[PDB]
């Protein structure tokens, strides 16, 4: 089979700049090479076919070139919705094969998160569990530190985090942190808080609530 | 206009046989070569089956002998029959239409893709999620806006899909990637930001769907 290599595996670029990602085949494939776009949770989308031929509906800022073994996809002016992974595909030898993909990240301005906290629902407490959620909304860069405090006691070993993909409109991220306790342990304490640290915050932010307030 | 619709996600055990299905809208399978392409979780794309207009089939050595692609144009149906499934077969399976060739038989590039069918191979059993509300409170407000959501806890396998107000509410929604719990089950949350002033007049319902277990839940999220 033909091995398709793409390098680098990740690019971080500013809006309106020009980007060129490369694809190399382990043997000559002429111009039987195509480019696809895919975002998390979505299906791939054809951008370019046979090295440089345009596709109906694709913005003109996309263009490709190359013949033989070295190929290049160029985005003339990078837009927010261009945050995605880009794959090349050879169709010269059976079976057709894809490259590993190059992920493009948008580099925007610093934006501090909006912090929210949710107490557990009475429906969940009736089942014997208590989940406390801390929400960090629309921030950049993706690095962020979240800490849980119960009655001012720093917690560890009882929480889990998850971060979203980059937003296709404002290029920000969002993060959720869930503290999970048993009903018995939840009713042993009164104050619950999450403390957030981020590059866009000159001082840490703390959202808290009192059990039964 | 032109699109592809596929069957739902499912969980099956090692060694099982399973059939997927895909149907066309505004075009006919009888005049277009069709293919199946899969994407393992966190991996790239792999073509696994193709059929030309004559009905001849193509397979790569990775799955030849285990996968069978077939077609029933009169029924508007494309099928992928898989057998002797194993962990390595866990992936999202897309049906894809071959693109128009420039030379005078598939071209092997794909101009149309379906939404994908997520198939998980595992020895565990399915479990539907429990949905709890994340009620908007004074601790989830800021500058006249309020955050609310739903918690989808303790399910297996992936994925669960979440919509709001039957798809009418999309702006400002964030559905986080699932997290793996110590018990082996998954959990996620879905949140949205709305005007605080309209919390009394508007209704906010999160729609959860877990096809592998045929579970559908609609939870009304009200302030508390």
Numbering used by the authors:
A (entry chain B): 1 to 213
B (entry chain A): 1 to 104, 108 to 227
Q: What does the article say, verbatim?
A:
The HIV-1 envelope glycoprotein (Env) is the sole target for neutralizing antibody (NAb) responses. The development and structural determination of soluble native-like Env trimer mimics, particularly ones based on the SOSIP technology, has provided a platform for structure-based immunogen design. Here, we describe a detailed characterization of neutralizing and non-neutralizing mAbs isolated from two rhesus macaques (RMs) previously immunized with the BG505 SOSIP.664 trimer. We therefore selected three Fabs (RM20J, RM20F, and RM20E1) that bound to different epitopes for high-resolution structural determination.
For a more detailed view of the mode of RM20F recognition, we solved a 2.2 Å crystal structure of unliganded RM20F Fab and a 4.3 Å cryoEM structure of RM20F Fab bound to BG505 SOSIP trimer. Two additional mAbs isolated from rh2011 (RM20F and RM20H) bound to an epitope near the fusion peptide (FP) and were capable of neutralizing both the autologous and N611A BG505 pseudoviruses, but the latter virus more potently. Only a few mAbs, 4 from rh1987 and 2 from rh2011, neutralized the BG505.T332N pseudovirus but one of them, RM20F from rh2011, did so potently. RM20F recognizes an epitope spanning two gp41 protomers and a single gp120 protomer that has 1126 Å2 of BSA at the interface. The RM20F HC contributes the remaining 78% of the paratope surface area (876 Å2) and uses its 20 residue CDR-H3 to wedge between the FP of the primary gp41 protomer and the HR2 helix of the adjacent gp41 protomer. In comparison to the FP-targeting bNAbs VRC34 and ACS202, RM20F lacked neutralization breadth when tested against a panel of multiple heterologous viruses likely due to the dependency on poorly conserved residues, such as 85 and 229. The epitopes of the FP-targeting bNAbs VRC34, ACS202, and DFPH-a.15 overlap to a large extent with the epitopes of RM20E1 and RM20F, with DFPH-a.15 and VRC34 also neutralizing more potently in the absence of the N611 glycan.
